[PDB]
Design a protein around this ligand. Structure first.
Ligand SMILES: [K+]
Ligand SMILES: [K+]
Ligand SMILES: [K+]
Ligand SMILES: [K+]
Ligand SMILES: [K+]
Ligand SMILES: [K+]
Ligand SMILES: [K+]
Ligand SMILES: [K+]
Ligand SMILES: [K+]
Ligand SMILES: [K+]
Ligand SMILES: [K+]
Ligand SMILES: [K+]
Ligand SMILES: [K+]
Ligand SMILES: [K+]
Ligand SMILES: [K+]
Ligand SMILES: [K+]
Ligand SMILES: [Mg+2]
Ligand SMILES: [Mg+2]
Ligand SMILES: [Mg+2]
Ligand SMILES: [Mg+2]
Ligand SMILES: [Mg+2]
Ligand SMILES: [Mg+2]
Ligand SMILES: [Mg+2]
Ligand SMILES: [Mg+2]
Ligand SMILES: [Mg+2]
Ligand SMILES: [Mg+2]
Ligand SMILES: [Mg+2]
Ligand SMILES: [Mg+2]
Ligand SMILES: [Mg+2]
Ligand SMILES: [Mg+2]
Ligand SMILES: [Mg+2]
Ligand SMILES: [Mg+2]
Ligand SMILES: [Mg+2]
Ligand SMILES: [Mg+2]
Ligand SMILES: [Mg+2]
Ligand SMILES: [Mg+2]
Ligand SMILES: [Mg+2]
Ligand SMILES: [Mg+2]
Ligand SMILES: [Mg+2]
Ligand SMILES: [Mg+2]
Ligand SMILES: [Mg+2]
Ligand SMILES: [Mg+2]
Ligand SMILES: [Mg+2]
Ligand SMILES: [Mg+2]
Ligand SMILES: [Mg+2]
Ligand SMILES: [Mg+2]
Ligand SMILES: [Mg+2]
Ligand SMILES: [Mg+2]
Ligand SMILES: [Mg+2]
Ligand SMILES: [Mg+2]
Ligand SMILES: [Mg+2]
Ligand SMILES: [Mg+2]
Ligand SMILES: [Mg+2]
Ligand SMILES: [Mg+2]
Ligand SMILES: [Mg+2]
Ligand SMILES: [Mg+2]
Ligand SMILES: [Mg+2]
Ligand SMILES: [Mg+2]
Lengths: 168, 46
RNA sequence: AGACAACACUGACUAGGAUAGCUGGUUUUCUGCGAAACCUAUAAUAGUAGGCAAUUUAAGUAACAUCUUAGUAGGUACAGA
RNA sequence: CGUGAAGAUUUUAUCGGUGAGUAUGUAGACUCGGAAUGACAAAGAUGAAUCUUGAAUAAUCAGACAUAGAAUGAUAAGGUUGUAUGUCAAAAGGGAAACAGCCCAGAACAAGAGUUAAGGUUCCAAAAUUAUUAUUAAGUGAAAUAAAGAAAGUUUUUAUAUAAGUCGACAAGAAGAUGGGCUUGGAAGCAGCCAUAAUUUAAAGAUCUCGUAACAGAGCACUUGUUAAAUCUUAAAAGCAU
RNA sequence: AACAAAGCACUUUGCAAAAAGACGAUAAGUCUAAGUAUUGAGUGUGAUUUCUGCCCGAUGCCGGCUGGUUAACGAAUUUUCUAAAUUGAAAAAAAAUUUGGUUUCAGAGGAACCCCCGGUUAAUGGCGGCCUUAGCGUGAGGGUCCUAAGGUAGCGAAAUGCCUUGGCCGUUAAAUGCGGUCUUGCAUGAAUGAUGUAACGAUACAACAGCUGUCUCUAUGAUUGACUCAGUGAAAUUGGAAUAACUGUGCAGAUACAGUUUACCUCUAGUUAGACGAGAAGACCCUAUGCAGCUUUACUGUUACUAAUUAUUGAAUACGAUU
RNA sequence: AAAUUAGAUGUAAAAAAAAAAUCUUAUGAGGGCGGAUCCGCUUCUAAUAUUUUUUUGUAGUUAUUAUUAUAAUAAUAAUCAUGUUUAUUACUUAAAAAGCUUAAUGGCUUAAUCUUGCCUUACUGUUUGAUUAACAACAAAUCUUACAGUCGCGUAAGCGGGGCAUAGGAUCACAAGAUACAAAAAGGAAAGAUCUUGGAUUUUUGGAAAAGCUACGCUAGGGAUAACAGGCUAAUUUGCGCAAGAGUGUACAAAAUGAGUGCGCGGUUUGGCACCUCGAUGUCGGCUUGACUAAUCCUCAUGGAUGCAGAAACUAUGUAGGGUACGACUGUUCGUCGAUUAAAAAGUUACAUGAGCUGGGUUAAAUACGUCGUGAGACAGUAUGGUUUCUAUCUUCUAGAGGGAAUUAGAAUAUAAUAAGGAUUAACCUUUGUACGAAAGGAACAUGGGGUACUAUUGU
RNA sequence: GGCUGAGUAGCUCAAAGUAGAGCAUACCGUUCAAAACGGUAAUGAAUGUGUUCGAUCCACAGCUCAGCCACCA
RNA sequence: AAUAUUUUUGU
C-alpha cells in the first residue's frame, strides 16, 4: 500500500474515533527525526483526509520543482471514513466508505524535508502547504526540544517540572 | 442492526469472581466462573 | 349516480338487548411518610403481569450507611511498540 | 558480448518481496507496563433506624436537561442510543435582566439595620464611586469571547546598533580582462541553456528591479564623504487594541 | 366523454304436463304467456361507410371410453371387556378355545366432480429477443434462441408520450396552445371493438369577424341599504380583564414575563393586520388485537346445483361376470 | 509452483563440608508469661527460601609433559556409563499455529491432545450448597455435594451421574413401558392418577389453524406521529465574503482573470430532527394594499485600468431618494420569446396579505384513457367537471367628535418655537462638431430652452 | 435514488468430479470458375479475491449491465 | 405403359 491508500479492506467499517490527546506527558511525534525541517500542527487535534494531504505534497513539489530535496511523510491515512447520505434520514445502519484519513495530535510533525536548498525556500513551501491544510501549522527545525501538550520543553524545562503540582 | 435488521442480545453469563479474598464460603459455593482455566483449583477446591 | 325507499341509506325509521386496553370528569379539612418513567414477559410496544420497590406497624439486628487499617478480584485513562 | 531465433553476465542509489534494528508513528475487536475512581468482604469506630423479616398492600413501566466520555449523524441539531453524577419531574426561596433541568440552598408560622451561601456593592436597586500595581483609548469592553489573517496602533520583555557618528537624508563612485561561451534575425549583466577557482580596487553579482529590435541609459547590492542623536538603532516574542 | 339507445353479435329455451329465466322461512303456484326458435331470457358491443387479424397452451364452459379413481354400500377380515361351559392349570395362578352380550379393526367390487381425449375467442384472456450487412451510412438480404401465438390492418407526443415546450409546417409582432405531418408507441390496436365523414351538442379545446367599461382608466347619474331621529327588538360569542409599541425571553410566533419607549378620559362611522379570530372533539396522516361495505385461487362455513343409494317398490326374460 | 522420506535448542549425570545473619513456617520442645491442644505477645530448636554472603574442598581413573628415585609429586586434557550406542535418564527448546463435534472467544501441552489395553457411571432413587438470591421477576435452565443400590478401570490412591468450555421450545392431546393408587350398588372393567420415554421452522420460537380494497367510508383517540408554516441545525443550495496564488493576460501574479483549497458570514433552497398546533395554524399562483433589508438593473459622486486617447464598457468604493414598464406562451412561481426603455435587478415579512377578493393548479365524491393488480381497486401518470361561510367585542389603524388641568378667573380673534408627515424620475437640444483622435467617432464644466401676456433672449 | 437477475469458442446456445453440440472459419476434393455439396481439422468458461480435496458452479467486491420499485399528503 | 429427389450464378 501507500501512505494515502493503505492495504486495508473497505468493507470492514471503523468507528469515528478520536485523535490522541496525551495527558500524561507524552512527546510522541512532536520532533524532527529524519529531515532537517518540519511542519507542525500547533492549534488543535484533527482528522486530516487523504485528499488534503495529497494536495499538500503537490503544493510543496510545485514550489520546489527542479530542485534536490527529500520529502518525508510522518502520517499515514489508515482510518477509513464512512459517510451516510446527507439527504438520508437517521438510522438504517452505518454509512458507506467515503475516503481514507489520518488522526493527528496537537504539536505533531506532518512533513519533513532534507535537501541542499535555502531555508527561506523551504519556508515558502511549508507556508503554502499550511494555507491549504486544515488548521494552523508552524515551521520547525531539527534539534529543538519536543512539545508536551501545548508547552515546549525550552530553557531546561523537563516533563517532571510540568507534573510537579507546585509551579508558582 | 442495519439495512437488514438482526437482533443481537444474548443472555448475560455473569462470568468472573463470585467471592473475593478472605471471604467466607461453605462447600459448594461458586468462587470463580470462567471459560477455560484462567484460575486453577488450589487447596480445598474442586 | 352506491341513485332513491317521508331529519338518516356502501343499507331507513322505531322498540328491546352492548362494549369501549380510548378521551373527559371524580366534591371537606388537618397530620405523617413518600416514588417511577428501569429490568423481564406479553398478537406486545399509549395496555398488563411479575420484580426492583412507595406505604402501614410488629418482631429482629453480628441490620444498613460512612470512614479508618489490612486484604482480594479486574486491565480503563495513561503510557508504550 | 553473442546466436540461424536463442540467452548469458554483469551493474543500478528503479518497483515488489525477504532478513535485521532497544528506529519513527498508528490502535473498538494490540496491552509487555499501569493508575485514580468504583466493587467485594473482615474488624473497629461513628451516625439522623436510614437495614432485614412477618403481616397488610400501591403506584410506575412517553421521561427531560446540565456536566464528563463515547456510538450514531456531518467532530450538526433543544438530534438519537448507552454509561457516570446531580437537579427537574414532585422543590418554593436567592443569583443567572426575563428562566422546569445551570450556581447556591431544601419553605411549619412571625420578629431582627441579626449571622451567612451563591452572587454582588455609581443610579434604577439592599451594599465600596473601598485600597494596591499594570494594561487599553477602541465605549473595545462592562453576565451568550465570531475565525484565519493583515498592519511604522500601543506597552512590556528578551536580543542588538551607537561620538570608532548608529538611523535617515543628501553628494560622488559603483571599474577592468569582457559584447563570458552557447543559442538567436538580433541575446552586449538583465529570453533561454552551461560555467561563474580569478583579477584589480575606497569598494563593484559573468548580475537583483526597470529600460533597448539589439546597444545605449536610469537604479540596487556594495564603497567614501558631509549633516547630526549623550536613556532616542534594528528585529523578534508576548499582552491589550484596530 | 358517464347511463340508455336503434342496430350488431354470441350463449341459452322443443313447451308430454315445470320452455328456459325470476320469485316462493317452501312449496303449491305466479310473471314469462292465453307466448312457441322470426319466442322468451341472459351477456357484451353501441346507427351507418371501410373493417374486425394471430393463438385453444392457461382459465371457464361443452362433449366424449364396456377406461382409471370411486364416499355410501359391500365379498373377504380383525379386536377390547364381561358371563357361562369346556379345556388347561390343578402350586400362591393364570392362560387358551367356544357361545351370549358389549366394543373395535377391516375393504375385491363399486358414482359424479376429478384424471384422460377432443372442441370453442363478438368466452374470461394472451398476442417476443439477439447479432449480421450493398462502404461510412442505411439494412432489402442472411444468421440463430424461445413461445400456445408472437400486435395483423389501422391509428399514433393521442382524453393514451414519463423523458418533453419531441422535430418540421401553418396560425401569433412573440405558441409549453390548436391544426397538419414525421413517428424509435416509458405504457396504441381491432365488438373492454379499430377507423373516416354527413347530421346533431347549454360537452371540451383553438382561431377569425363584429361587439362591447373586460381592460388602458375610470367618471357621473338613479333606486334600495348603509347614516341620523322615533317605534319594536335578535344571534353566534364570552374563565376573569385596568386588554399599547419594540427587542429579547419562554411548550420554541407575547396586550399580560424582562428591559426600554410611548400614551389625557370617553364615544361615533369606517377598516380587517392580530387576538395562532368564531363555527364543526381534523375528512388528510397515524394509532385501536375499534367498525362497516366490497373483493379474491385468505381461514372456516351455508346454499343453488350435480352424483350414488336404503325407503315408498313389484316382475320377466336375458347378456354376463364372480366362482 | 505444488507428490515421498529424513532432519532442524542446549545442559547435566564421583562428591560436597562448615560459620553467622535476615525473615517466613511447625499437629516442634504438649516451651514460657497474660488471659497441652483457644488467642495476642513471646525466647529456643528444626525445616524451606533468601545475601554477591566468610570460606574450605574440587578428587579418583586413563593419558600426556616436566622434575625426582617402575614409583612419587606437580601441571594440562578427557571422564553420565558393568551398560545390547539406535544408549539411557533429568531438565530446556519464544510466540503463533495444529489438535480438542460444528462460528467466535478463552483455555489445555505437567492434559482437556494423541496411541493402546479393558470397558459402556451416556447408571437407578433421593439429596446438599451455589450461580454475591441464574436470565435486574416467575418458569423451562447451569455447575456442584452427600447417602443407598451395583458396575467398569486401576498395583494403589482413587476416578466415573457423557463429550475442553460457551448455541436443541413447554403444556395439552397422542403413543410405548412400568407403579397397584382409586374403581360412582357390588365383582371386574373402562376412563383417570404417579414414574420413565418417543414423534414439533407450536420459527410472531413463554407456544392463534388466518388474504386484500375503500377517493362512499364511519367511530373512539394522537401534536405520544407525517403533510403546510414557525423553532433548532447549517450537510447542501439557485446566497456571499476573506486569505493564499498554480495558471491565463504577446511582456508582466494581483487591469481583468483565479484550478484544486483553507478560514468564515448569512438564513433566501433541498434536507435532518419532531419542539409548538390534529375538542382544527386553510394551500401554489393571480389581484389589491403595503412595510423593511441592501449582497445595486438604471440615475448621482468617485479610485484602478502595458490592458483609462475620446466615446461606450469592465472592475471597485460610497449610496436604497425615486424608478425597475408593455405584450405573446404556460395554472404556473420560474423560464422562453416579441418590441420599447435611463434601466426594464433581487430578497424578507406564516415562501407578507383568502374573518381583503379570485379559484386556473394541487387534494374528495362522478367518468374515461394508459399502466399496475386474479379481483375489488390503485397510480410525484394524464384528462373533462366539481357549494370558497362569518352583522367586528378588544388591540393597532384611517377620519370626526363629547369631556378635560390652565401658570391657574374665563373668553373672542390672529398666531410662534417645535413636532409628525408629504413632495422626490429621466432624457434631449444649445454649448459643439469644442477637448481628444490618423480617421470614424465624440465628451466634461457652464448658460438658456416660464414669454405667439409682462419680462428676457434670438432673427428679420 | 433503492433492490433484484444475468456475463463461456468468431457467433449461438447447453452443462462443484464437465468444458459439449451446432453454425461460422481453415485445408483438400468436386466444377471451365464460383456457390451449394463431400471429406478431414482447429476454436472458450468475464474481473479479481475467498471457500472447497477440487469451483462454469458456492461466497464476496468491482466493470458491463438489463429489469423492477421511486406510494399517502 | 401413367413413370417423376435436388442442381443457382458468369464484369
Ligand atoms: K391500549
Ligand atoms: K408533610
Ligand atoms: K419528607
Ligand atoms: K497487563
Ligand atoms: K458595547
Ligand atoms: K359502452
Ligand atoms: K365507443
Ligand atoms: K388460445
Ligand atoms: K381450453
Ligand atoms: K341533448
Ligand atoms: K403549547
Ligand atoms: K382583523
Ligand atoms: K480408551
Ligand atoms: K363397580
Ligand atoms: K359545466
Ligand atoms: K410654523
Ligand atoms: Mg490552513
Ligand atoms: Mg434470527
Ligand atoms: Mg363509485
Ligand atoms: Mg347517497
Ligand atoms: Mg429516575
Ligand atoms: Mg402470543
Ligand atoms: Mg433530547
Ligand atoms: Mg425524543
Ligand atoms: Mg408525570
Ligand atoms: Mg427553584
Ligand atoms: Mg445585574
Ligand atoms: Mg447588617
Ligand atoms: Mg443605594
Ligand atoms: Mg551571455
Ligand atoms: Mg357498428
Ligand atoms: Mg320452468
Ligand atoms: Mg378479435
Ligand atoms: Mg383442448
Ligand atoms: Mg361402512
Ligand atoms: Mg376401495
Ligand atoms: Mg373400477
Ligand atoms: Mg403495427
Ligand atoms: Mg375486444
Ligand atoms: Mg333605532
Ligand atoms: Mg417574541
Ligand atoms: Mg402584570
Ligand atoms: Mg368589512
Ligand atoms: Mg391571549
Ligand atoms: Mg476428546
Ligand atoms: Mg435473580
Ligand atoms: Mg415470544
Ligand atoms: Mg427467555
Ligand atoms: Mg376516484
Ligand atoms: Mg411533537
Ligand atoms: Mg483614473
Ligand atoms: Mg432628498
Ligand atoms: Mg403566503
Ligand atoms: Mg387573514
Ligand atoms: Mg368597536
Ligand atoms: Mg434628476
Ligand atoms: Mg412675440
Ligand atoms: Mg451475362
Amino acid at each position: 500500500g501507500s501512505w494515502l491508500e493503505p492495504n486495508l479492506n473497505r468493507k470492514k467499517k471503523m468507528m469515528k474515533g478520536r485523535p490522541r490527546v496525551p495527558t500524561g506527558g507524552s512527546t510522541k511525534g512532536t520532533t524532527v527525526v529524519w529531515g532537517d525541517y518540519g511542519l507542525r500542527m500547533r492549534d488543535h487535534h484533527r482528522r486530516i483526509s487523504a485528499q488534503q494531504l495529497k494536495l499538500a505534497e503537490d503544493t510543496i513539489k510545485q514550489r520546489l520543482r527542479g530542485q534536490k530535496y527529500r520529502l518525508y511523510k510522518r502520517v499515514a491515512c489508515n482510518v477509513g471514513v464512512y459517510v451516510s447520505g446527507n439527504e438520508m434520514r437517521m438510522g438504517k445502519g452505518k454509512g458507506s466508505f467515503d475516503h481514507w484519513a489520518t488522526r493527528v495530535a496537537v504539536n505533531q510533525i506532518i512533513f519533513e524535508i532534507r535537501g541542499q536548498l535555502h531555508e527561506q525556500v523551504i519556508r515558502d513551501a511549508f507556508r503554502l502547504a499550511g494555507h491549504k491544510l486544515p488548521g494552523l501549522y508552524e515551521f520547525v527545525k531539527k534539534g529543538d526540544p519536543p512539545v508536551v501538550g501545548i508547552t515546549k520543553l525550552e530553557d531546561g524545562l523537563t516533563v517532571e517540572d510540568l507534573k510537579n503540582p507546585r509551579k508558582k | 442492526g442495519a439495512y437488514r435488521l438482526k437482533p443481537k442480545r444474548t443472555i448475560p453469563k455473569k462470568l468472573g469472581a463470585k467471592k473475593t479474598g478472605d471471604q467466607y464460603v461453605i462447600p459448594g459455593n461458586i468462587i470463580y466462573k470462567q471459560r477455560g482455566t484462567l484460575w486453577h483449583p488450589g487447596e480445598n477446591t474442586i
